[PDB]
Curated annotation (Swiss-Prot), chains A, B:
Residues of the full protein shown: 13 to 62 of 380
Similarity field: Belongs to the cAMP-dependent kinase regulatory chain family.
Gene: PRKAR1A
Assembly mode: The inactive holoenzyme is composed of two regulatory chains and two catalytic chains. Activation by cAMP releases the two active catalytic monomers and the regulatory dimer. Interacts with PRKACA and PRKACB. PRKAR1A also interacts with RFC2; the complex may be involved in cell survival. Interacts with AKAP4. Interacts with RARA; the interaction occurs in the presence of cAMP or FSH and regulates RARA transcriptional activity. Interacts with the phosphorylated form of PJA2. Interacts with CBFA2T3. Interacts with PRKX; regulates this cAMP-dependent protein kinase.
Lineage: Eukaryota, Metazoa, Chordata, Craniata, Vertebrata
Tissues in which the protein is found: Four types of regulatory chains are found: I-alpha, I-beta, II-alpha, and II-beta. Their expression varies among tissues and is in some cases constitutive and in others inducible.
UniProt modification remark: The pseudophosphorylation site binds to the substrate-binding region of the catalytic chain, resulting in the inhibition of its activity. The physiological significance of the in vitro phosphorylation of a proximal serine is unclear.
Protein known as: cAMP-dependent protein kinase type I-alpha regulatory subunit
Subcellular location: Cell membrane
Functional summary from the UniProt entry: Regulatory subunit of the cAMP-dependent protein kinases involved in cAMP signaling in cells.
Organism: Bos taurus
Amino acid sequence: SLRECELYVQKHNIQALLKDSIVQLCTARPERPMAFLREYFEKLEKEEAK
Amino acid sequence: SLRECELYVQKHNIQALLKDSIVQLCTARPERPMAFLREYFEKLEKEEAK
């Protein structure tokens, strides 16, 4: 029952967020992961305009 | 080369963050996923003190 529900959050929903996520945690040096996610997309959101 | 680097961000690093993440996106109704992550852990962080 919980598997079919996860069919939406595959590589099309949280992927755009997890993509850069691991790219930063790959170094395994999260001085603060609890707050990292907060400032992670907070600043990444205002990435200027192409 | 990128696989060994992902050995750290398995179910022990971003899991605590993805755990409640899917629990909310499971409904597939993210009015704003880009900002959701920001307020997702921002408020979840101050979850009172056990």
